[PDB]
Amino acid sequence: EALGLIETKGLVACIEAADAMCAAANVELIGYENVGSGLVTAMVKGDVGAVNAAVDSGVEAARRIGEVVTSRVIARPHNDIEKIA
Amino acid sequence: REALGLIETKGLVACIEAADAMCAAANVELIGYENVGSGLVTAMVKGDVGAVNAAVDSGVEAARRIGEVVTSRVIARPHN
Amino acid sequence: REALGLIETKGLVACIEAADAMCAAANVELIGYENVGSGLVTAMVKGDVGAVNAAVDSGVEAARRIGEVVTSRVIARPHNDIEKIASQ
Amino acid sequence: HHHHHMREALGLIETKGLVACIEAADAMCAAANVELIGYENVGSGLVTAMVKGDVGAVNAAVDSGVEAARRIGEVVTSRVIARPHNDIEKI
Amino acid sequence: HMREALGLIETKGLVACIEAADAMCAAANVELIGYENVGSGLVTAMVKGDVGAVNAAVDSGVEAARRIGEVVTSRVIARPHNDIEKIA
Amino acid sequence: HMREALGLIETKGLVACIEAADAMCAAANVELIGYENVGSGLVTAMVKGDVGAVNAAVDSGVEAARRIGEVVTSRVIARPHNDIEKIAS
Numbered sequence: 449e450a451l452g453l454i455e456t457k458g459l460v461a462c463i464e465a466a467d468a469m470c471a472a473a474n475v476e477l478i479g480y481e482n483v484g485s486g487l488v489t490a491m492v493k494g495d496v497g498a499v500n501a502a503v504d505s506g507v508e509a510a511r512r513i514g515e516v517v518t519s520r521v522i523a524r525p526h527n528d529i530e531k532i533a
Numbered sequence: 534r535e536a537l538g539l540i541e542t543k544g545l546v547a548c549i550e551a552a553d554a555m556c557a558a559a560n561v562e563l564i565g566y567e568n569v570g571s572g573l574v575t576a577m578v579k580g581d582v583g584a585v586n587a588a589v590d591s592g593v594e595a596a597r598r599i600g601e602v603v604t605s606r607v608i609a610r611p612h613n
Numbered sequence: 614r615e616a617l618g619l620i621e622t623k624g625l626v627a628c629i630e631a632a633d634a635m636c637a638a639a640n641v642e643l644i645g646y647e648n649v650g651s652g653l654v655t656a657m658v659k660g661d662v663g664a665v666n667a668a669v670d671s672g673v674e675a676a677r678r679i680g681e682v683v684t685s686r687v688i689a690r691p692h693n694d695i696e697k698i699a700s701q
Numbered sequence: 702h703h704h705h706h707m708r709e710a711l712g713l714i715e716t717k718g719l720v721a722c723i724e725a726a727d728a729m730c731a732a733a734n735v736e737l738i739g740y741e742n743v744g745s746g747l748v749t750a751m752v753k754g755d756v757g758a759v760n761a762a763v764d765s766g767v768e769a770a771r772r773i774g775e776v777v778t779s780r781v782i783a784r785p786h787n788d789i790e791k792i
Numbered sequence: 793h794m795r796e797a798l799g800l801i802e803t804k805g806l807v808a809c810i811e812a813a814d815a816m817c818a819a820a821n822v823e824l825i826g827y828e829n830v831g832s833g834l835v836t837a838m839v840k841g842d843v844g845a846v847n848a849a850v851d852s853g854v855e856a857a858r859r860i861g862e863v864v865t866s867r868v869i870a871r872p873h874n875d876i877e878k879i880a
Numbered sequence: 881h882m883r884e885a886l887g888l889i890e891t892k893g894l895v896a897c898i899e900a901a902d903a904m905c906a907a908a909n910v911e912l913i914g915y916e917n918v919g920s921g922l923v924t925a926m927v928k929g930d931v932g933a934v935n936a937a938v939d940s941g942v943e944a945a946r947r948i949g950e951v952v953t954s955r956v957i958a959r960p961h962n963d964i965e966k967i968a969s
Contacts (some may be wrong), residue, residue, distance in 0.1 A: 455807040459569045460541040460604040470612035477612070483806045484650075484919065485833035486571040514604045518807045518861050526817035529810055532827045532835075545649045546621045546684045549695055556692040563694060565701035570744070570831070570919070572651035574698075600684050625743045626715045626778040629789055636704035636786035643704065646792045650919065652745035654792075660702050680778050719918045720890040720953040723964055730961040740967050744831075746920045774953045793905075802895040830894045831919035865895045865949050873905035873912070876898055879923075880914030 450499035451525040452492035454506050454516060459488050461514025466490035468509035473498035481532055487517060491530060496523045536585040537608040538578035540592050545574050547600025552576035554595035559584035573603065582609045616665035617691040618658035620672045620682065627680025628654035634675035639668035647698045653683065657696055662689045706784035710759040711738075712752040714766050714779045719748050721774025726750035728769035733758035741792050747777060751790060756783045797846040798872040799839035801853050801863065806835050808861025813837035815856035820845035828879050834864060838877055843870045885934040886960040887927035889941050889951065894923050896949025901925035903944035908933035916967050922952065926965060931958045 452475060454465040459482075466477055475494035482488045492502055500521050507519045522529070538561060540551040545568075552563055561580035568574050578588055585607050593605045618641060620631040625648075632643055641660035648654050658668055666687050673685050694701070712735065714725040719742075726737055735754040742748050752762055759781050767779045782789070799822060801812040806829075813824055822839040829835050839849055846868050854866045869876070887910060891897040894917075901912055910929035917923050927937055935956050942954045957964070 451810075453807045453810060455805055458541055458573055458603055459567055459575045460539045460606050463537075463539060464606055464608070467608050467612055481806055482569045483829045483833050483835050484570045484831035485804075486569060486573050487805050487833045488569055489806045513606055517805055520807050520811055520860055522811070522814055526814050526824070528824055528826075529814050529817070532806065532829070544621055544653055544684055545647055545655045545698065546619045546686050549617075549619060550686055550688070552695050553688050553692055556695070563692065565694075566698045567700060568649050568698065570650035572649050572653045574649050599686055623745075624715055624747055624778055625741055625749045625792065626713045626780050629711075629713060629792075630780060630782070633782055633786050633789045636789065640702045642702040643786070643788050645788075648743045648792075650744035652743050652747045654743050664702070679780055718890055718922060718952050719916060719924050719967070720888045720955050723886075723888060724955055724957070727957055727961050727964045730964065737961075737963060739969070742918045744919050746918065746922050748918055773955050798898075800895045800898060802893055828894055830917045830921050830923050832921035834893050834921045836894045864893055867895050867899060867948055869899070869902055873902050875912055875914075876902045876905070878914070879894070879917070 449493055450496040451522045452499040452503040453489055453520045455487055455489045455518045456510050457486045457515040457517055461510045462488040462490050464513045465506040465510035469502035469506035472505035473502040475499055475502045534611055534613050535579055536582040537611045538585040538589045539575055539606045541575040541603045542596055543572045543601040543603055547596045548574035548576050550599045551592040551596035555588040555592035558591035559588040561585055561588045615659050616662040617688040618665040618669040619655055619686045621653055621655045621684045622676055623652045623681040623683055625654050627676045628656050630679045631672035631676035632656040635668035635672035638671035639664035641665055641668045704786040707787055709753050710756040711782045711785040711790055712759040712763040715747055715749045715777045716770050717746050717775040717777055721770040722748035722750050724773050725766040725770035729762035729766035732765035733762040735759055735762045793871055793873045796840045797843040798869045799846040799850045800836055800867045802834055802836040802865045803857050804833045804862040804864055808857045809835035809837050811860045812853040812857035816849035816853035819852035820849040822846055822849040881959045884928050885931040886957045887934040887938045888924055888955045890924040890953045891945050892921045892950040892952055896945040897923035897925050899948045900941040900945035904937035904941035907940035908937040910934055910937045
């Protein structure tokens with residue numbers, strides 16, 4: 449199960465990124481994470497082919513609304529790398 | 534789920550103004566606010582896509598007079 | 614229904630001064646404070662529109678001597694729950 | 702909608718960073734018979750020390766607290782409110 | 793003091809930190825303790841294991857995170873003192 | 881007044897604060913109270929002990945943290961007043 453991540457400057461661009469990821473491919477929204485400085489990350493789960501398509505589409509949609517700081521697809525993520533606590 | 538209206542501002546007072554103007558302009562329901570730090574605050578609204586579009590346009594106009602609107606968006610069919 | 618008074622400052626001390634001056638200037642009730650990060654603090658008051666306008670004008674005047682007032686606003690007819698800064 | 706005055710003065714010191722605020726609070730407590738209410742943080746590194754007590758003691762505490770914090774950090778603002786209204790300290 | 797080494801990578805942004813933690817885990821036998829966020833976008837990934845494995849994991853994690861975002865600082869503490877990793 | 885000195889090192893970033901706390905513990909017989917984070921990357925490491933041990937620990941901790949990151953401020957309070965270290969509540 450690949451992990452898809454999109455980090456934006458501001459929440460509204462992140463909500464748009466998460467919505468566009470869910471509409472583009474069969475991915476599951478894990479949730480959002482905020483680390484301060486306006487940085488918010490949307491995290492998705494699914495097959496590597498679906499995650500790559502979802503992230504590519506999510507970045508394109510978020511760039512029209514706000515600023516995308518970074519994006520990433522981790523094909524084989526290690527245990528608990530998505531659990532930030 | 535019905536349409537989702539979002540207005541993000543730099544400062545809380547501009548966000549409260551945006552939420553008040555969104556409610557006064559159309560038949561929308563205020564879901565609440567979301568704050569992500571660094572002064573960023575988002576007002577969220579629910580309703581028919583036509584009402585949400587009118588509410589966000591009027592909320593952005595009112596918040597721009599008071600403070601800085603960072604971004605705004607209407608998502609017609611949110612996946613939630 | 615009653616009016617909502619808001620004063621946002623950069624720094625807490627200027628906001629506490631604004632809230633104290635609002636309470637001394639008019640028969641308004643201090644709802645509380647809200648902080649959104651980046652030093653942005655908002656003092657919120659409720660009361661009759663005339664009292665709220667006088668309280669905010671005085672709160673802004675007093676806070677400007679101590680620190681920086683970013684923005685101020687009086688909403689005469691605020692909609693329900695617009696002062697509750699939470700997800701719900 | 703009727704705020705009353707509280708029986709004791711309130712002193713405030715806002716510094717850029719926590720260590721300068723802890724120094725300010727310690728110097729306020731050592732300079733006069735004041736009670737530390739606590740600390741409040743509003744972001745951007747702005748930390749506030751709040752004390753209560755007689756106006757004379759509060760003034761002496763805030764003046765001394767500002768002097769001590771300025772040696773190890775930056776004091777952004779300070780203020781003494783002699784007859785503070787009830788709930789202005791509840792943040 | 794303690795037997796297992798501590799590996800730390802601090803980045804500006806969460807995605808670069810997740811990449812650093814993933815690369816650390818893939819490069820050597822290091823267990824991911826977790827993440828720590830102190831505001832201003834600063835996120836830290838923490839690992840533990842043998843000093844040789846931790847040095848290889850941090851070097852690889854920094855290299856991978858630099859391609860994605862900004863690495864603010866990195867460190868391997870060979871003999872960390874007790875409770876140094878517990879942020880209260 | 882507390883029966884022991886308070887040592888404080890505030891850094892910009894957690895990693896330089898962890899380094900400062902580790903160097904403080906290695907330099908003298910001090911006890912790490914814990915960390916306090918106030919946002920904007922500001923992290924403070926707090927230590928307890930005799931004033932001589934605390935002064936040595938803070939000087940060493942500042943030197944080690946300056947190699948890794950940015951030290952915003954440092955302080956040793958020889959006779960700290962009650963509850964000045966309690967940031968929460």
